[PDB]
Design a protein around this ligand. Structure first.
Ligand code: SRM
Ligand code: SF4
Ligand SMILES: O=N[O-]
Ligand SMILES: [Cl-]
Ligand SMILES: [Cl-]
Ligand SMILES: [K+]
Length: 538
């Protein structure tokens, strides 16, 4: 790699970071959108106030404003559902470590309730909330309401640092390695500039996923993050070994690799900043399929990339990885659904199944009520799109288990439901090839009616090759496609994936059988379960 390749390609100008004049040749259309107008201005200079007043039909008549609502608004966490729910916006939060309060949950419920049949909410595969039904004129008030309850939606889409994932059992599990909440909180504060916006990290070449590990179970999926912090003691000091570059895409899926770097626990934010600065400064900005950070690491080599991180650290110090980390490889991933004792004597948490992560306003209010009556007003989200209510006095559990709402959001659903994960799909997502959430529930119910099993088989349904529902981590994955029935008629189908393993012995699954009509999946899946996962026909 020539020295010229290492010249930073962006510069700070008037509070924002912009591509230098000589580094604009050959850039992709999204890079052009970012040059034409700085997306962060919609929040940081309150551009949204006047934009929200323009009728959407008028907005669509000019490129600048159409790009504002379809692209730039994703820096404020607002996602126009142009194709499938025209004129409505999904809104996505920052929710480090998946932690919410009952007051926040009620606020979110109040927003979606206004929109009737156009509103609902979802738990995401980054243990985050999305709300639906939002209309542009309401955006300024919703932004204010979020701030009022201590939430932000900043920088949650497009070329930004995505939700910091941590251990859903942080602070409460007897078996935790280290409480991840202080670290994910710090990362979210850094990323969003304490909810004011942080332009230094909002003009990346592409999305970028961080997580902090605190569990032997590796609930945080460090192998598929751009930056994963692996807890490790080095020379008698607590800190983290760093994994970099994990990502999924239509073109390529790759597990994170060692940076060969250890940082003291206090250097979590400094090293996140250094890595993001290197990616921002040096990453390719052409073909969008080749802009994730792993492509930079491959171009420079991991050592070349490491040197770029090192030079951006305070005092330019970046120690080599600790020979061992704290994660025990002898481990069986633990079910968190149901009632479990906390490390705090006399307290339990309860994991509740949320079928395919989908809730309505009334459901959110009920869950918030349970969290207040039984817990400490806290609701935790998981990356399997479930919930945990922590800090419940154990003597209250008997009463809790009788609550009517638990017949719907159950502490002990059938085993295949416990592991079921499904993305948005074509109900709302414009890229989706198939419907996912209703279909996945229907097929899973039919499969479980036919077989019993004891292995915790994890089934993931994703609607298109973007693989937001991570089919490559599943025991059995389903990637949406169009295919043909016996008569040659167009039907919805799935490409079926096998081989995904999570935890310390992680492995990426691969296509097993392409183009299976969705109507033909039940017998295929039943046989796979019997033949490979010890399932027994009923
Ligand atoms: C909601 C969520 C799926 C879910 O049902 O849980 C989701 C939904 C969308 N993803 Fe995703 N992604 C979700 C996690 C993921 C993950 C999983 C993860 O982070 O562990 C991946 C794969 C891992 C990765 O990125 O390395 C993922 C890979 C993508 C990609 C492909 C990335 C790439 O490099 O090619 C896109 C398309 C893009 O960004 O160009 C994308 C694009 C989208 C959009 C924003 C597309 C669009 O605007 O319609 C989807 C919004 C649909 C909607 O209305 O909900 N989504 N997306 C997840 C929100 C996470 C969050 O809270 O921030
Ligand atoms: S995997 Fe495809 S269909 Fe599913 S939410 Fe992501 S972009 Fe939409
Ligand atoms: O929002 N999925 O990158
Ligand atoms: Cl996006
Ligand atoms: Cl769309
Ligand atoms: K779920």
């Amino acid at each position: 790699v020539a020295a010229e390749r290492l010249e930073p390609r962006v510069e700070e100008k008037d509070g924002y970071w912009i591509l230098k004049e000589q580094f604009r040749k050959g850039i992709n259309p999204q890079e052009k959108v970012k040059i034409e107008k700085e997306p962060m201005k919609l929040f940081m200079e309150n551009g949204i106030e006047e934009l929200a007043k323009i009728p959407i039909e008028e907005i669509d008549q000019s490129k600048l404003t159409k790009d504002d609502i379809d692209v730039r608004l994703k820096w404020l966490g607002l996602f126009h559902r142009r194709k499938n729910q025209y004129g409505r916006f999904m809104m996505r939060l920052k929710l480090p470590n998946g932690v919410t309060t009952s007051a926040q949950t009620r606020y979110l419920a109040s927003v979606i309730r206004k929109y009737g049949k156009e509103g609902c909410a979802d738990i995401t595969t980054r243990q985050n909330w999305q709300i639906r039904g939002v209309v542009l004129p309401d955006v300024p008030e919703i932004l204010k309401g979020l701030a009022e309850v201590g939430l932000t939606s900043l920088q949650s889409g497009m070329d930004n640092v995505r939700n910091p994932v941590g251990n859903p059992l942080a602070g409460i599990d007897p078996e935790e390695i280290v409480d991840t909440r202080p670290y994910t909180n710090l990362l979210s504060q850094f990323i969003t500039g304490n909810s004011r916006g942080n332009p230094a990290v909002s003009n990346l070449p592409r999305k970028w996923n961080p997580c902090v590990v605190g569990s032997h179970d590796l609930y945080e999926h460090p192998h598929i993050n751009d930056l994963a912090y692996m807890p490790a003691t080095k020379d008698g000091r607590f800190g983290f070994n760093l994994l970099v570059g994990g990502f999924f895409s239509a073109k390529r899926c790759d597990e994170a690799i060692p940076l060969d770097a250890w940082v003291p626990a206090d250097d979590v934010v400094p090293v996140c900043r250094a890595i993001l600065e290197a990616f921002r400064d040096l990453g390719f900005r052409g073909n969008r399929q080749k802009c994730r950070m792993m492509w930079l690491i491959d171009e420079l080599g991991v050592e070349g990339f490491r040197a770029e991180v090192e030079k951006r650290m305070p005092q330019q110090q970046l120690e080599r990885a600790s020979p061992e980390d704290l994660v025990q490889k002898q481990w069986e991933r633990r079910d968190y659904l149901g009632v479990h004792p906390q490390k705090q004597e006399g307290y339990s948490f309860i994991g509740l199944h949320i079928p395919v992560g989908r809730v309505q306003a009334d459901d959110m209010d009920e869950l918030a009520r349970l969290a207040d009556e039984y817990g400490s007003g806290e609701i935790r989200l998981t990356v399997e799109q479930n919930i945990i209510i922590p800090n419940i006095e154990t003597s209250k559990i008997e009463a809790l288990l009788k609550e009517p709402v638990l017949s719907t959001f159950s502490p002990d659903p059938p085993i295949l439901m416990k592991g079921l994960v499904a993305c948005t799909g074509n109900q709302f997502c414009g890229q989706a090839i198939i419907e996912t959430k209703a279909r996945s529930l229907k097929i899973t119910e039919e499969v479980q009616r036919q077989v019993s099993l004891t292995k915790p088989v994890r089934m993931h349904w994703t609607g298109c090759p973007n693989t937001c529902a991570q089919v490559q981590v599943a025991d059995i994955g389903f990637m949406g496609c169009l295919t043909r029935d016996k008569n040659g008629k167009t039907v919805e189908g799935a490409d079926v994936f096998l081989g995904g393993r999570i935890g310390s012995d992680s492995h990426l699954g691969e296509v097993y059988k392409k183009a299976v009509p969705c109507d033909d999946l039940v017998p295929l899946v039943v046989d796979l379960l019997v033949n490979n996962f010890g399932a027994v026909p009923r």
